[PDB]
Amino acid sequence: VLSEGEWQLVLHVWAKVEADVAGHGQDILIRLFKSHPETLEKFDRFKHLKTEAEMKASEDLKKHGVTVLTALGAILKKKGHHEAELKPLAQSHATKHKIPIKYLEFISEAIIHVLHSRHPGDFGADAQGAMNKALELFRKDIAAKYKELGYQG
Numbered sequence: 001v002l003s004e005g006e007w008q009l010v011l012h013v014w015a016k017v018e019a020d021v022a023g024h025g026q027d028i029l030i031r032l033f034k035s036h037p038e039t040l041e042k043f044d045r046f047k048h049l050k051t052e053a054e055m056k057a058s059e060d061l062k063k064h065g066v067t068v069l070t071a072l073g074a075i076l077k078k079k080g081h082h083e084a085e086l087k088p089l090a091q092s093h094a095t096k097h098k099i100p101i102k103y104l105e106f107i108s109e110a111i112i113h114v115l116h117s118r119h120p121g122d123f124g125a126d127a128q129g130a131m132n133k134a135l136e137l138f139r140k141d142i143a144a145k146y147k148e149l150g151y152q153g
């Protein structure tokens with residue numbers, strides 16, 4: 001359970017993200033795909049992209065970055081009371097998109113790295129730990145739904 005002070009840290013940096021949702025979403029997905037290329041293979045939509053320059057030039061990848069960070073922002077702003085928002089995400093990511101929990105750990109690492117690059121004055125260690133906690137709580141609650149459905153592994 002995050003404290004109120006931890007949530008404030010999380011949402012304070014998240015409000016900085018929302019000034020350039022699309023730039024963040026490109027940086028985060030690029031990082032995820034470069035750092036963990038097995039993740040790119042899950043997107044039939046993006047698996048033709050073979051270089052970082054092609055990734056940065058793809059408008060479709062930019063659009064999907066905004067889809068992802070808009071869904072994450074809506075979950076973070078519920079401060080833990082996010083059951084209605086996770087149900088559908090867990091269900092599609094487990095059963096249709098076939099995404100392992102470990103790949104949610106990987107995109108959490110990329111989100112934390114990109115927030116540290118773009119917002120260092122609002123993303124010191126206190127805020128990095130709080131955002132780590134918020135992304136762990138996201139993964140915990142999605143993993144419990146995966147387990148229900150037979151996909152925790």
Ligand code: HEM
Nearest residue numbers: 039042043045067068071072088089092097099103104107
């Ligand atoms: C912060 C974590 C994430 C969030 C908030 C998120 C959010 C979303 C949303 C909102 C959609 C569209 C609606 C839906 O299908 O449920 C989607 C689609 C999708 N996601 Fe994610 N996602 C996340 C992580 C991942 C990861 C780590 C992968 C793959 C490694 C992945 C793979 C996919 C795929 C394959 C689709 C369908 C894309 C398409 O072909 O249009 N997601 N995601």
